[PDB]
Design an enzyme around this catalytic site. Structure first.
Site, PDB file in Angstrom:
ATOM      1  N   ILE A 165      16.877  -9.151  32.166  1.00  0.00           N
ATOM      2  CA  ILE A 165      16.562 -10.090  33.244  1.00  0.00           C
ATOM      3  C   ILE A 165      15.062 -10.299  33.448  1.00  0.00           C
ATOM      4  CG2 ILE A 165      18.616  -9.496  34.599  1.00  0.00           C
ATOM      5  CD1 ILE A 165      16.657  -7.907  36.427  1.00  0.00           C
ATOM      6  N   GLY A 166      14.226  -9.851  32.520  1.00  0.00           N
ATOM      7  CA  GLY A 166      12.793  -9.996  32.724  1.00  0.00           C
ATOM      8  C   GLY A 166      11.930  -9.463  31.603  1.00  0.00           C
ATOM      9  N   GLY A 202       7.358  -9.072  30.304  1.00  0.00           N
ATOM     10  CA  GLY A 202       5.949  -9.262  30.580  1.00  0.00           C
ATOM     11  C   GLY A 202       5.145  -8.084  30.073  1.00  0.00           C
ATOM     12  N   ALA A 203       3.920  -7.938  30.570  1.00  0.00           N
ATOM     13  CA  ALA A 203       3.093  -6.790  30.216  1.00  0.00           C
ATOM     14  C   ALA A 203       3.655  -5.534  30.874  1.00  0.00           C
ATOM     15  CB  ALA A 203       1.643  -7.020  30.641  1.00  0.00           C
ATOM     16  N   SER A 204       4.313  -5.721  32.013  1.00  0.00           N
ATOM     17  CA  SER A 204       4.909  -4.614  32.745  1.00  0.00           C
ATOM     18  C   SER A 204       6.193  -4.155  32.054  1.00  0.00           C
ATOM     19  CB  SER A 204       5.212  -5.037  34.187  1.00  0.00           C
ATOM     20  OG  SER A 204       4.137  -5.773  34.749  1.00  0.00           O
ATOM     21  N   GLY A 205       6.401  -4.635  30.833  1.00  0.00           N
ATOM     22  CA  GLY A 205       7.578  -4.267  30.075  1.00  0.00           C
ATOM     23  C   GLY A 205       8.778  -5.173  30.295  1.00  0.00           C
ATOM     24  N   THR A 206       9.950  -4.637  29.989  1.00  0.00           N
ATOM     25  CA  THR A 206      11.183  -5.394  30.011  1.00  0.00           C
ATOM     26  C   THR A 206      12.172  -4.769  30.991  1.00  0.00           C
ATOM     27  OG1 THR A 206      10.785  -5.720  27.664  1.00  0.00           O
ATOM     28  CG2 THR A 206      12.935  -6.405  28.524  1.00  0.00           C
ATOM     29  N   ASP A 224       1.055  -4.561  48.926  1.00  0.00           N
ATOM     30  CA  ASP A 224       1.488  -5.808  48.296  1.00  0.00           C
ATOM     31  C   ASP A 224       2.781  -6.353  48.898  1.00  0.00           C
ATOM     32  OD1 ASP A 224       1.452  -8.023  46.614  1.00  0.00           O
ATOM     33  OD2 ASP A 224       2.228  -6.959  44.871  1.00  0.00           O
TER      34      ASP A 224
HETATM   35  C1  LIG Z   1      13.077  -7.840  40.020  1.00  0.00           C
HETATM   36  C2  LIG Z   1      13.766  -6.965  38.994  1.00  0.00           C
HETATM   37  N1  LIG Z   1      14.045  -5.661  39.586  1.00  0.00           N
HETATM   38  C3  LIG Z   1      13.133  -4.582  39.325  1.00  0.00           C
HETATM   39  O1  LIG Z   1      12.044  -4.746  38.531  1.00  0.00           O
HETATM   40  C4  LIG Z   1      13.371  -3.276  39.888  1.00  0.00           C
HETATM   41  C5  LIG Z   1      12.409  -2.138  39.614  1.00  0.00           C
HETATM   42  C6  LIG Z   1      11.572  -1.683  40.632  1.00  0.00           C
HETATM   43  C7  LIG Z   1      10.673  -0.642  40.368  1.00  0.00           C
HETATM   44  C8  LIG Z   1      10.626  -0.066  39.095  1.00  0.00           C
HETATM   45  C9  LIG Z   1       9.642   1.042  38.861  1.00  0.00           C
HETATM   46  C10 LIG Z   1       9.589   2.094  39.776  1.00  0.00           C
HETATM   47  N2  LIG Z   1       8.703   3.106  39.641  1.00  0.00           N
HETATM   48  C11 LIG Z   1       7.888   3.017  38.577  1.00  0.00           C
HETATM   49  C12 LIG Z   1       7.937   1.961  37.680  1.00  0.00           C
HETATM   50  C13 LIG Z   1       6.985   1.942  36.523  1.00  0.00           C
HETATM   51  N3  LIG Z   1       8.825   0.951  37.801  1.00  0.00           N
HETATM   52  C14 LIG Z   1      11.448  -0.528  38.066  1.00  0.00           C
HETATM   53  C15 LIG Z   1      12.339  -1.564  38.335  1.00  0.00           C
HETATM   54 CL1  LIG Z   1      13.362  -2.146  37.085  1.00  0.00          CL
HETATM   55  C16 LIG Z   1      14.511  -3.048  40.748  1.00  0.00           C
HETATM   56  C17 LIG Z   1      15.488  -4.169  41.064  1.00  0.00           C
HETATM   57  C18 LIG Z   1      16.642  -4.106  41.865  1.00  0.00           C
HETATM   58  N4  LIG Z   1      17.460  -5.189  42.073  1.00  0.00           N
HETATM   59  C19 LIG Z   1      17.073  -6.350  41.456  1.00  0.00           C
HETATM   60  N5  LIG Z   1      17.875  -7.562  41.601  1.00  0.00           N
HETATM   61  C20 LIG Z   1      17.310  -8.776  42.212  1.00  0.00           C
HETATM   62  C21 LIG Z   1      16.317  -9.502  41.305  1.00  0.00           C
HETATM   63  C22 LIG Z   1      16.217 -10.949  41.756  1.00  0.00           C
HETATM   64  C23 LIG Z   1      17.275 -11.761  41.007  1.00  0.00           C
HETATM   65  C24 LIG Z   1      17.054 -13.256  40.998  1.00  0.00           C
HETATM   66  N6  LIG Z   1      15.697 -13.727  41.211  1.00  0.00           N
HETATM   67  C25 LIG Z   1      15.404 -15.142  40.942  1.00  0.00           C
HETATM   68  C26 LIG Z   1      14.650 -12.780  40.877  1.00  0.00           C
HETATM   69  C27 LIG Z   1      14.802 -11.484  41.632  1.00  0.00           C
HETATM   70  N7  LIG Z   1      15.998  -6.521  40.652  1.00  0.00           N
HETATM   71  C28 LIG Z   1      15.230  -5.440  40.464  1.00  0.00           C
END
Ligand SMILES: CCn1c(=O)c(-c2ccc(-c3cncc(C)n3)cc2Cl)cc2cnc(NCCC3CCN(C)CC3)nc21
EC number: 2.7.11.1
Length: 293
Positions: A28-29, A31-35, A141
């Site tokens: 679902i994503g 970038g530089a912050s990975g996948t 942020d």
């Molecule tokens: C937006 C994608 N996403 C995330 O990136 C993370 C997330 C948070 C923090 C870290 C993390 C923590 N500690 C350290 C590190 C180095 N990383 C990792 C991750 Cl995968 C949790 C998450 C939970 N639920 C959802 N669903 C809704 C997305 C929506 C859908 C539809 N729409 C259009 C765009 C948003 N998306 C998430």
């Protein structure tokens, strides 16, 4: 150091390869912050979000370790739950609870919230912020993008990549880390700011919920902070449409004088929060927004 960072990530993470532990990957994503993927915990049925990173091409690995450690030790119902992490070679995995309700951005961008729904969202965020600030964590942020929603109306802060940890000895920060449109004026005018930058940010997010975007969104970022510094408290396009108590809530969030601006603890007592609708009132906006994107 490269080596030390790897040894430190090694101690943090669980052992082994996690691709046994999770099954139904859908990217679902990127970038530089990975996948980022959604997946299912093959054991428990829980849907999760996973970020995969290659470390050989991550600039500031100290920020990555910091984020993980901050998630680990600051759990809270209004913060997206950090589940586990793994390191296979140079490949780091971070596993988080998955929230199917989308982001608030989707909601404000595709729907129109009433004051009761807004109050509920504001309440939930301030709960997160009160907990964080009391633990000497500044998110730095806050914006609709970093609010995630459950299908049940649940409200959770995410993306602590830019958070600061303060101490009695260094209880103020100066680094300009946040997203321009949401930054407090003092982040640009001075070189000393505290946790109340998150309150200003929440105020701008409240504006998002009313008007659909933060002020100056059309303007170049460079120019936004200049406008923020020089205009101070932003103006609403139709302030008279708002309830007196909502307007008062905003004025407290968007107070130019940091000392007068409300703290989270203080704002949790504000009477605007008392018209909050039950969180489930958010589900029709979530569903609609989902269906619109
Ligand atoms: C937006 C994608 N996403 C995330 O990136 C993370 C997330 C948070 C923090 C870290 C993390 C923590 N500690 C350290 C590190 C180095 N990383 C990792 C991750 Cl995968 C949790 C998450 C939970 N639920 C959802 N669903 C809704 C997305 C929506 C859908 C539809 N729409 C259009 C765009 C948003 N998306 C998430």
């Amino acid at each position: 150091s490269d080596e030390e960072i790897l040894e430190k990530l090694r101690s943090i993470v669980s052992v082994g390869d996690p691709k046994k532990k999770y099954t139904r990957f859908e990217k679902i994503g990127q970038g530089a912050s990975g996948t980022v993927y959604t997946a299912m915990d093959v054991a428990t049925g829980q849907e999760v979000a996973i970020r995969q990173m290659n470390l050989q091409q991550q600039p500031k690995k100290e920020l990555i370790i910091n984020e993980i450690l901050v998630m680990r030790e600051n759990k809270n119902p209004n913060i997206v739950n950090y589940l586990d992490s793994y390191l296979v070679g140079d490949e780091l995995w971070v596993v988080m609870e998955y929230l199917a309700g989308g982001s608030l951005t989707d909601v404000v961008t595709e729907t129109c919230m009433d004051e009761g729904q807004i109050a509920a969202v504001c309440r939930e965020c301030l709960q997160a912020l009160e907990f964080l600030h009391s633990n000497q964590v500044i998110h730095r942020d806050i914006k609709s993008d970093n609010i995630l929603l459950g299908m049940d109306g649940s409200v959770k802060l995410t993306d602590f990549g830019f958070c600061a940890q303060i101490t009695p000895e260094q209880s103020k920060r100066s680094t300009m880390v946040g997203t321009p449109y949401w930054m407090a004026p003092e982040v640009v005018t001075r070189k000393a700011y505290g946790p109340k930058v998150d309150i200003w940010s929440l105020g701008i997010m409240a504006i998002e919920m009313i008007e659909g975007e933060p002020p100056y969104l059309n303007e170049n970022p460079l120019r936004a902070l200049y406008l923020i510094a020089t205009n101070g408290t932003p103006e609403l396009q139709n302030p008279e449409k708002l309830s007196a108590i909502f307007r008062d809530f905003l004025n407290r969030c968007l107070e130019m004088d940091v000392e007068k601006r409300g703290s989270a603890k203080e704002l949790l007592q504000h009477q605007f929060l008392k018209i909050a609708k039950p969180l489930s009132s958010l589900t029709p906006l979530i569903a609609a927004a989902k269906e619109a994107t």
